Amino acid sequence: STYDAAAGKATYDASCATCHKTGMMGAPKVGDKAAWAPRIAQGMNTLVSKSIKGYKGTKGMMPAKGGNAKLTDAQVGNAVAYMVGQSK
């Protein structure tokens, strides 16, 4: 159901920050407002779907579930909620 960005921080820290804290190899850096603005406009459904499925965009490779197949979709989406909430 509804996103839990606070619970999402645990997943973000363990599984996502490794690329997104500094923005390595094209990953949009958490807190980078210009990088995130058009991504946020896609809405959460699309952000979370692309995060669970993986994709390659103009910046680099976003691996499915951050590369950790042991994550649930709920955990991944909660981590996205955390990232978006910190990037406005």
Ligand code: HEB
């Ligand atoms: C290896 C490294 C890495 C990692 C680990 C990650 C991990 C992650 N991630 Fe990432 N990403 C990335 C890399 C990455 N990543 C990149 C590079 C990108 C960009 C792509 C393009 O091009 O755009 C992204 C992107 C991204 C996004 C955006 C989308 C759109 O715009 O549509 C999101 C939301 C995310 C989330 C995430 C999460 C939640 C996680 C954990 C689970 N990602």
Ligand code: NA
């Ligand atoms: Na929607």
